[PDB]
Design a protein around this ligand. Structure first.
Ligand SMILES: [Zn+2]
Ligand SMILES: [Zn+2]
Lengths: 366, 366
């Protein structure tokens, strides 16, 4: 396999389906990436993550650099070996979690210094150091380091952070390229910023395309703006990105967010305890109504959890705070997301995705 | 298969190896039973419990009667169906945990009333109600309901509790026998009491043998007396029990407790977070010395955890409080216990168990 090859096999409207080929495996798109925080997808062995249908997982750099440490992971053979996942891993830059989880943060044009939320130890991230950490982890898809824009943001502040992010995108590009082993074996994605402002989104897309990346993320969304606004911004933002590269929407999308985002040209998603997804909408398994319900979590789901255990049992486990409850809920939910992606891929391939989206929504929100 | 058939295939000294055949499966002896508390063996799917080599698990009645409730479990099809374990289950009587976990406990000749430690709700257990609850769960091996003797106990109080326990053993026997479905499909074990006193142990063994049970537990040990005293009591107590029925030592035994107990004629064991068992003794995986240790938990262990992950990774997970850490530690530890039992069974079958016990101890305590 090549370092990186994105191929589009079929299209419907703005939606696309295809594959990303990388050295460690093929990723089917549109893709959902389960999130591994501190070198683990919560409550699941990697084999179970794979069994749900995942082709790639996300690793959170911020958590990894704190524990067990990036240099330590490299000494131990890299993240894949450490956690036992041998397929592609996309690593985030660490920037967002520094902003949201760390303390005593000090921002500058060079980067950010901060104190750990775990031990109060002092740490640093810059475009160069973020790219280096992602190299030390052995990441397959590296994210450029940027400066996030809070929602809501004034036009001036959104412009300032977008402009800094684009300067940092060039620094990320250059750091990645100067490291031969990384440049030859991994891919680098840039992140579009600009808040909800069309002109800033356009400037950001232009800057990123001029630098050139293997893929393009839409950053700065899923941060409190709501689905209507997110969809409105995606409507104008995604067409600004190069068509022939993957488009990655960063941040937890509910099933309905994913469907609408695919309708708007997004190819990749991520999303990190009593809520269970079903085709008739989410249920909270803690609800007393499930205490004697012998049906599986979802009536159609092909996951191992739905083949073997009842709502009543999972209700009991979750109410009791049992570890197996978290294990079963997480496996089902990730499996549900993967089945959603498969239905999306198949419907685009068959030119009936618009109908699928309508049918999905009618039932999910009935 | 029969309701119950214990066959002894080989012997060495007081040690025995053989099988218990029951309707739901064959149990190889000496046997280790992983413990399921509130209808789950902590952090493990039943398939994983089976994969470690377990033939039978223990279910804790006290926890089950509180949550989700015995009648509820029966309505839902029984414990096996509820939790997804289709092989034999031995249920305890609930008595010990009432004494150790419940509040506002009131004891009498009829039984015990108590308040839940979870919700403060009022509950009752008697020989009759305990046997009924075990029936509602669908238990394969039912334990007689007894009155535990604290350690240390005066000769008078040990005698009183032993005598009451024997009266309750007869009541348990009669309750079990009067329920046709239970009598025909399950087995009933009696529990020897008498604290550390040889004469009381003898009276208890005689009373139990006169009533007649399918198996005999040594109760009242592993409660603070220490291994030397436990072994001393087993030395005289086990020979008092009928030779041709299984002998069950109740309560957590470390690997060395199990080896010594088998040397003294015990056939069955149970035992319910950073401690990992190895053939060179236990290690605490939290210790900083393991942070960069790429070796598996144990160098010989054939478990899936030791095939796939390092001490360094498990150290990280446990220090981070990650659920996967508990999952991996528990699978390895139960698998270690099962490998211990297999080595015990094979060595008795080959007439080299005494040598095995010596070799095991020399290395485990080196
Ligand atoms: Zn499912
Ligand atoms: Zn192991």
């Amino acid at each position: 396999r090549p370092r990186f090859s994105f191929s589009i096999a079929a299209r419907e409207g703005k939606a696309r389906t295809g594959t990303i080929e990388m050295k460690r495996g093929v990723i089917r798109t549109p893709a959902f990436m389960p999130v591994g925080t501190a070198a683990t997808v919560k409550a699941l062995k990697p084999e179970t993550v794979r069994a749900t249908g995942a082709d790639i997982i996300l690793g959170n750099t911020y958590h990894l650099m704190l524990r067990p440490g990036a240099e330590r992971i490299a000494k131990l053979g890299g993240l894949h070996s450490f956690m036992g996942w041998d397929r592609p891993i996309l690593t985030d830059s660490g920037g967002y979690q520094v902003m949201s989880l760390s303390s005593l943060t000090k921002q500058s044009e060079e980067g950010v210094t901060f104190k750990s939320h775990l031990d109060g130890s002092r740490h640093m991230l810059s475009p160069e150091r973020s790219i280096e950490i992602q190299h030390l982890l052995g990441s397959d898809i590296v994210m450029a380091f940027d400066e996030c824009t809070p929602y809501p943001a004034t036009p001036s502040r959104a412009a300032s952070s977008m402009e800094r992010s684009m300067r940092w995108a060039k620094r990320s590009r250059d750091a990645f390229d100067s490291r031969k082993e990384q440049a030859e074996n991994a891919a680098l994605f840039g992140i579009q910023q600009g808040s909800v402002f069309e002109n800033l989104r356009q400037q950001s897309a232009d800057a990123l395309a001029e630098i050139g990346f293997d893929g393009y993320a839409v950053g700065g969304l899923a941060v409190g703006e709501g689905q209507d606004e997110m969809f409105r911004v995606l409507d104008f933002s995604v067409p600004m990105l190069p068509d022939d590269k993957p488009h990655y929407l960063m941040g937890c999308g509910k099933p309905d967010d994913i469907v609408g985002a695919v309708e708007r040209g997004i190819d990749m998603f991520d999303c990190v305890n009593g809520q269970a997804f079903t085709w008739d909408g989410p249920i909270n398994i803690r609800n007393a109504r499930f205490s004697e319900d012998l049906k599986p979590l979802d009536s159609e789901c092909h996951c191992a959890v739905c083949q073997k255990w009842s709502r009543a049992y999972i209700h009991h486990l979750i109410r009791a705070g049992e570890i197996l409850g978290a294990m079963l809920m997480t496996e089902h939910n990730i499996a549900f997301y993967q089945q959603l992606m498969q239905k999306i891929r198949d419907s685009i391939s068959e030119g009936r995705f618009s109908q699928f989206a309508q049918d999905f929504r009618a039932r999910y929100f009935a």
